[PDB]
Design a protein around this ligand. Structure first.
Ligand SMILES: CC[C@@H]1C[C@@H]2C(=O)CC[C@@H]2[C@@H](C(=O)N[C@@]2(C(=O)O)C[C@@H]2CC)C1
Lengths: 568, 144, 18
């Protein structure tokens, strides 16, 4: 017996380190520690799939149990990125098929998944695949689905939210009904399915005792009563469809909602059907009024009933008035999102605008907020000051102001932004999209200067000249990903700022002072740094996308995409 | 009451349900060698001592707030000891003790940089700079 | 002229509205 070293005990200890950023470190302390991390890492996420070879991954982490790949850039979620752009998943499944023999969970996000490659997935992994997440993907069909539900008989979680595919039939759902037991979560939330029987969804609920969440297409809620009755342990339900004909004023007044149901959002819900929630609103903790059909008043009467609500997502109809209701009724709120509604026929009402008024009201009410994302119609430096004044543990903050309004109160926001970034020092993600005169080179340099923890930034029409970009660039200690559109910055301005940024690994840009040369961008050509240029699909300015990759340049570029490689 | 004979010949009087916390001694009352007392020549006597003190205290859960207290305090020891404990919790089969001794070492890492680590553990970095670069590159550009 | 791009999920809903 010699003295006991750390070496004699590290194999055991490693598996108690969960934090991805601590494994990141542990792997770098020496050769043995690196191997031990390598063989024990369970989950890995690639923010961009083109960032490394699928070979490189399987070599470094032979024993992955869970994997998550992202393809197309965030902009794709706004119909700004060509469909053919990339993110094909096939190289990765043929890698999983051969070298990740341990994988039980797969999550593809904004990628291209084909019928072939998921039949390949299905057959290669079979019963071992507990979870499959097709998050906002395209390129497959119900055949693909039918293939994974017949070969993976033990699927616990299955997800297709916002995916676009070709619907040929419904035998995929029916096959779940007839044979699946293990299902825990089932999600096809933003999806046009027109050939699936609700009877099948009902028989699934009857068979999967562990069924906890389910989100759904445009099913008629009435056809789901059989479901709801059988879905005992159900905690979350988003989706469905509330269709009111006048011939039944009391159509939806006999709804038996599962007892445990505490996270939800019915689609198309009007004021007439809204009442069906009251009998248990004290219990609701998450609300998705995103696709609800109710007006600024109706919002207030409902929010008012949910004191324990800690997450709300809704359109800007919520109104300043609504936000005020939310300010002293739901103190427990942690996440709030306000996507922009119909900005065509006026607003959705005459209170359906949000402004400094509601903002500052909210800042005082819910000081527990950790994520706040708002499409606002008018602001004030003062409002921002109160943000960074009350809700300290804001982690994700996103603000976008609509061009709808003509004159906005006080416009240059330099000093508001400043106290915000200074109070919310827990901030890690930050989005700030304005109108032209919105922020000055001085205010911009504030951002670089007072955002030490921010790793992602989306920036609107900020700055006035290349001065503000360069000033900004000497800051941002931890900035990794940077997206900016609608900017007055020049090609050589960008290029020079990228070199000054210490942490930057991903950059997307739409709108910038170009040049026929194109050679201005070149002055940022590091090694391992790929740059690409784009048009747009679903008058579109050229996009710039650049990212680090230990792979080299992708083979799969569309024709519509150009890769820069020094003097052409 | 059972007798555990330490690594350096040292009998130990311990209760029934105290020595059963180790599924290594539990699975050894079947093929009962408990005749000559359970021999375990791979536990220093100083350590085996600290082990029984842990089990003793947890067994008295028949009668949760003040446990995380005693536990946090029980761990205030030096490294070389902390390690010999993990090795011991794993030489026996005390699942609650490994979840503690290992989680303690794991906390010593959680937060430090690669340098701060091999510092506070005395480990010589043996990466050729190319290796170190590839790993840092994989870590910050590709995976996580 | 860079128009505020609408998140696809909503854009789909706003038309299923009318
Ligand atoms: C190319 C960038 C896109 C640009 C798009 C654009 O035109 C405005 C914002 C939208 C963008 C955005 O993500 N907006 C938010 C949101 O999560 O939707 C963050 C803001 C929520 C309040 C991204």
């Amino acid at each position: 017996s010699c003295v006991a070293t750390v070496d004699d005990v590290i194999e055991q200890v490693m598996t108690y380190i969960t934090d991805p950023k601590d494994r990141d470190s542990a792997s770098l302390v020496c050769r043995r520690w690196f191997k031990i991390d390598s063989e024990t890492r369970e989950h890995v996420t690639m923010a961009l799939c083109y960032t490394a070879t699928p070979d490189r991954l399987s070599r470094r982490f032979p024993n992955l149990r869970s994997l998550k790949l992202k393809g197309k850039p965030r902009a794709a979620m706004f119909n700004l990125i060509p469909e053919n752009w990339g993110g094909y998943v096939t190289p990765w499944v043929t890698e999983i098929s051969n070298n990740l023999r341990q994988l039980k969970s797969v999550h593809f996000r904004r990628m291209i998944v084909s019928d072939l490659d998921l039949d390949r997935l299905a057959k290669a992994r079979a019963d071992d695949l507990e979870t499959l997440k097709l998050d906002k993907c395209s390129g497959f069909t119900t055949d693909g689905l039918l293939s994974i539900v017949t070969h993976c008989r033990k699927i616990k979680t299955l997800l297709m939210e916002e995916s676009s595919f070709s619907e040929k039939d419904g035998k995929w759902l029916h096959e779940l009904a007839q044979h699946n037991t293990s299902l825990e979560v089932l999600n096809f939330y933003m999806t046009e399915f027109a050939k699936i029987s609700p009877k099948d969804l009902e028989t699934i609920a009857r068979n999967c005792r562990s069924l906890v969440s389910v989100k759904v297409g445009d099913f008629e809620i009435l056809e789901l009563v059989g479901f709801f009755k059988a879905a005992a342990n159900l905690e979350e339900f988003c989706g469905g469809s509330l269709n009111e004909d006048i011939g039944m004023p009391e159509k939806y007044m006999n709804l038996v909602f599962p007892r445990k149901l505490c996270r939800l959002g019915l689609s198309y819900m009007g004021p007439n059907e809204m009442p069906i929630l009251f009998p248990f609103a004290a219990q609701i903790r998450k609300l998705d009024l995103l696709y609800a059909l109710l007006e600024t008043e109706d919002h207030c009467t409902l929010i008012q009933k949910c004191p324990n609500l800690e997450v709300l997502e809704t359109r800007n109809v919520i109104g300043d008035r609504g936000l005020e209701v939310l300010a002293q009724y739901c103190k427990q709120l942690k996440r709030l999102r306000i996507e922009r509604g119909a900005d065509e026929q006026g607003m959705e009402d005459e209170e359906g605008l949000v402004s400094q008024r509601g903002l500052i009201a909210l800042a005082q009410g819910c000081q527990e907020l950790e994520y706040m994302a708002v499409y606002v119609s008018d602001i004030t430096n003062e409002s921002l000051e109160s943000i960074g004044t009350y809700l300290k543990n804001l982690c994700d903050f996103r603000l976008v102001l609509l061009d709808r309004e003509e004159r906005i109160t006080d416009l240059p926001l330099d000093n508001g932004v400043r106290s915000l970034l200074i109070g919310c020092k827990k901030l890690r993600r930050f989005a700030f999209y304005l109108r032209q005169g919105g922020l000055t080179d001085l205010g911009l340099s504030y951002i670089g200067q007072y955002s030490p923890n921010v790793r992602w930034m989306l920036l609107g029409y900020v700055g006035e000249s290349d001065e503000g970009l360069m000033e900004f660039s000497r800051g941002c200690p931890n900035l990794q990903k940077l997206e900016m559109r609608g900017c007055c910055f020049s090609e050589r301005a960008i290029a020079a700022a990228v070199t000054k940024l210490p942490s930057l690994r991903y950059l997307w840009v739409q709108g910038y002072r170009a040049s026929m040369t194109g050679q201005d961008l070149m002055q940022m050509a590091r090694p391992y740094w790929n740059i690409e240029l784009i048009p747009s699909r679903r008058e579109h300015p050229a996009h710039i996308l650049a990212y680090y990759s230990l792979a080299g340049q992708r083979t799969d570029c569309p024709t519509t995409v150009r890769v820069l490689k020094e003097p052409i | 009451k059972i007798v555990l004979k330490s690594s350096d010949g040292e009998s130990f009087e311990v209760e029934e349900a105290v020595a059963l916390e180790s599924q290594t001694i539990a699975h050894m009352v079947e093929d009962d060698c408990v005749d000559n007392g359970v021999p375990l020549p791979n536990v220093t006597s100083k350590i085996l001592a600290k082990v029984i003190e842990y089990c003793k205290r947890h067994v008295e859960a028949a009668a949760d707030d003040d446990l995380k207290a005693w536990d946090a305090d029980f761990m205030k020891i030096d490294q070389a000891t902390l390690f010999e404990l993990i090795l011991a919790a794993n030489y026996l089969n005390i699942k609650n003790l490994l979840d503690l001794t290992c989680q303690t070492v794991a906390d010593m890492i959680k937060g430090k940089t690669p340098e701060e680590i091999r510092t506070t553990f005395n480990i010589k970095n043996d990466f050729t700079p190319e290796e170190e670069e590839e790993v840092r590159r994989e870590n910050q550009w590709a995976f996580e | 002229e860079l128009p505020i791009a609408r998140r696809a999920s909503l854009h789909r809903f706003l038309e299923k509205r009318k």
